[PDB]
């Protein structure tokens, strides 16, 4: 006597006119002329943008920082559009098109002689950002498979998450910070400059609290 259980009903969810992911251009419409600094702080530390769900229920969460170029968008789009159910699923981009210019010098050139020429564009992504958001008349199990495939092919650590798994992920981290039996935490020591520890820490380590090392995110650190 199997115990049947009710199934969720998808009468409160409408599908956009264009459920598929739009096309992302290689370079912006009007090309940039001013070359920009390296500015590596834009993939360092936690994301302060696109960190919450807006329309859909599932997404790819970035578990690290990195740069998305056009080849990544092509991989994300074709894999998602080919694997989604257009009638019952929609997908929105949560990252902008490549806008940061990247310069390269001619092959075989020596150091010096001015900065190189703009080569391509990228999009900086910080850890904790949603990259693509999906929703519709589906469960997480239906999308988790191919969202994990696209996430595994991203230039940073990423993972397919749900409206619910994202929240438990955050509850578990806060639970660990509370039941941590270690009297010594990175934050406490680094904020009080205990042991004169700031001679080996970055100023950024006062807010990263040992959870970030460059572009890498460490979810085990409390």
């Amino acid at each position: 006597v199997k115990t049947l259980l009710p199934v969720p009903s998808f009468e409160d969810v409408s599908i956009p006119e264009k459920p598929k992911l739009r096309f992302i251009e290689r370079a912006p419409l009007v090309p940039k002329v001013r070359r920009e600094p390296k500015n590596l702080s834009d993939i360092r530390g936690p994301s302060t943008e696109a960190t919450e769900f807006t329309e859909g229920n599932f997404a790819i969460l970035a578990l690290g920082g990195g740069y998305l170029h056009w080849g990544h968008f092509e991989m994300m789009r074709l894999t998602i559009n080919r694997s989604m159910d257009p009638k019952n699923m929609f997908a929105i981009w949560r990252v902008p098109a490549p806008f940061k210019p990247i310069t390269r010098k001619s092959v075989g050139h020596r150091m010096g002689g001015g900065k190189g020429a703009i080569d391509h564009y990228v999009t900086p992504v910080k850890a904790g950002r949603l990259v693509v958001e999906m929703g519709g008349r589906c469960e997480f199990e239906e999308v988790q498979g191919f969202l994990d495939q696209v996430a595994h092919k991203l230039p940073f650590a990423a993972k397919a998450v749900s409206r619910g798994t994202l929240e438990k992920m955050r509850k578990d981290q806060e639970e660990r910070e509370r039941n941590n039996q270690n009297p010594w935490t990175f934050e406490r020591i680094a904020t009080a400059n205990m042991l004169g520890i700031r001679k080996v820490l970055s100023p950024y380590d006062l807010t990263h609290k040992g959870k970030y090392w460059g572009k890498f995110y460490m979810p085990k650190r409390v």
């Binding site: 001619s106 075989g108 050139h109 020596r110 010096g112 002689g113 001015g114 900065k115």
Partner: peptide
């Protein structure tokens, strides 16, 4: 071995005004 280019930005050599 390879012929190199040149920077196109001149000026910008004034020191601080204090």
């Amino acid at each position: 071995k390879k012929s190199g280019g040149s920077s196109k930005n001149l000026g910008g050599k004034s020191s601080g005004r204090r």
